[PDB]
């Protein structure tokens, strides 16, 4: 999973 | 350690998927610079708006590592400081890794 900025 | 923990085969494949699906965002791996005395970061994988500046990404890191604003944070790419005003799309275009990710490190003073 990705952190979304 | 991101590269050490994931084979080059798998890194390349995930970058290709992300660039296809989210073309307005930049896949960035963020790690603390070697020998730096500030907090390590919990999450390493960040999908960043292309227009986000380096300077604005400093604020993102600050909020994660919970560092007081009195203490400065610097972002490096390939061991050099990119300009604060540069957009992440630009840094990606010019310094992206062979695996398709952009690798950033950070430190304090």
From TrEMBL, chain B:
One of its GO terms (molecular function) is phosphatidylethanolamine binding. The keyword Lipoprotein applies. It comes from Marchantia polymorpha (Common liverwort). It is a lipid-anchor. It comes from the Eukaryota. GO terms for biological process: autophagosome assembly; autophagosome maturation; cellular response to nitrogen starvation; mitophagy. The keyword Lipoprotein applies. Belongs to the ATG8 family. This is Autophagy-related protein. One of its GO terms (cellular component) is autophagosome membrane. It is found in: Cytoplasmic vesicle, Autophagosome membrane; Vacuole membrane. Residues 1-18 are annotated as: Disordered. Keywords: Autophagy, Cytoplasmic vesicle, Lipoprotein, Membrane, Ubl conjugation pathway, Vacuole. Residues 2-18 have a biased composition (Basic and acidic residues). The chain holds residues 7 to 115 of 134 of the full protein.
């Amino acid at each position: 999973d990705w952190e979304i900025v | 350690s991101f590269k050490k923990e994931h084979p080059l085969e798998k890194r390349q494949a995930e970058a290709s998927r992300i660039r296809n699906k989210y073309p307005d965002r930049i896949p960035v791996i963020v790690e603390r610079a070697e020998k730096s005395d500030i907090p390590d970061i919990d999450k390493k994988k960040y999908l960043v708006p292309a227009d986000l500046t380096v300077g604005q990404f400093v604020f993102v890191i600050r909020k994660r590592i919970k560092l007081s604003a009195e203490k400065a944070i610097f972002i490096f790419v390939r061991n050099v400081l990119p300009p604060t005003a540069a957009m992440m799309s630009a840094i990606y275009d010019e310094h992206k890794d062979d695996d398709g990710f952009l690798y950033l490190t950070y430190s304090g003073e």
